[PDB]
Amino acid sequence: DIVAICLNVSNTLNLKPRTKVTGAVIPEFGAPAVISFTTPATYLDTQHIIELQ
Amino acid sequence: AIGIGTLIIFIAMVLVAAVAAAVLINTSGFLQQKAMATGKESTEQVASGLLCS
Amino acid sequence: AIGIGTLIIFIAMVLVAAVAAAVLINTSGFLQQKAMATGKESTEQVASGLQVIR
Amino acid sequence: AIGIGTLIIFIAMVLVAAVAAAVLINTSGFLQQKAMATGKESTEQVASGLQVIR
Amino acid sequence: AIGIGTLIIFIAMVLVAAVAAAVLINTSGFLQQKAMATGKESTEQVASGLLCS
Q1: Is there a smaller number of Cβ atoms within 10 Å at the N or the C end of chain D?
Q2: Cβ–Cβ under 8 Å, residues D36 and C32
Q3: Element of type H or E holding E9
Q4: Chains near C, with 3+ CB pairs < 8 A?
């Protein structure tokens, strides 16, 4: 299976450029998935969807 | 009499292997982050630049 | 007498250690073929091709 | 009394565990030399050679 | 009864892993020397020379 966890971060975390984001999805049992990315140096208006990790 | 003890130490064997596994799993996680980061960063460095006209 | 149980549990201990060993022997077999094939195939791929003369 | 046997079988259990440990200590010794030599030798092989000047 | 033996063989496991580690550590040391030496020597060879005037 593949499934997408959807999070709206607009007011909660302030993801401007050059910003490190760290985290995990932790299940009831078993090993966590590790989220780890740094947002790009430049965001362009021609490319509103970005691949982060 | 003998039977009783066998069971008890078996429990310990399980837990100790579990604890060791945790180290290996976790550590692999910790490295995954930095491994990727290093490659991406290094590529962007060698590829990018500006040229005087 | 204590001896009786000591014997019986030994029988078990042996058997379990056998089963545990088995899975590694079996798995090593499975991996052997898969590995060998992957190497061969990959080699032939790189090594081969055609060229347009004229 | 049950105690008597419990003592005697403990003596055995210790001794067996000793013998089992021994073989690993011994084998580790045997492997040590064989490994170290194999590395050294292989290194010297790659590192060395002659060149024809003229 | 069972407990006693578990402890004893544990000791052996430790020592055997230790002995094996020693090999790896030592060997790495032995190679470190020659690795460096080879590089330095080879560079000095290719770079140096004399020229008839």
Answers
A1: C
A2: no
A3: helix E2-47
A4: B, D
Q: E6 burial class (0-12, 13-18, 19+ CB within 10 angstroms)?
A: middle
Indicate yes or no: CB of B29 within 8 angstroms of CB of A31: yes
The H or E element spanning position A37 is: strand A33-38
Residue A35, strand partner residues: A23
> How crowded is residue E5: how many other Cβ atoms within 10 Å of its Cβ?
20
Q: In whole angstroms, what is the distance from residue B53 CA to residue E41 CA?
A: 42
The most distant pair of C-alpha atoms in chain E lies apart, rounded to whole Å, by: 90
Q: Specify the resolution in Å.
A: 3.1
Contacts of D2 in chain C (CB under 8 A): 2
In 10 A of CB D16, how many CB atoms? 14
Nearest CA in chain C to D7: C2
Locate the chain B residue with the closest alpha carbon to C3: B2
How many residues are recorded in chain D? 54
Quote the minimal CA–CA distance from D30 to chain C in Å. Answer: 23
User: C1 and D6: CB-CB below 8 Å?
Assistant: no
Of D13, A45, E22, D34, the closest CA to residue C9 belongs to D13
- Strand boundaries in chain C, DSSP class E: none
Q: Best mutation site among D6, D14, D15, D16 for testing chain C: the one with the most C CBs within 10 Å? A: D6
- A22 in helix, strand or coil? strand
3-state helix, strand, coil in chain C (%, to 5): 85, 0, 15
Which technique was used to obtain these atomic coordinates? Answer: cryo-EM
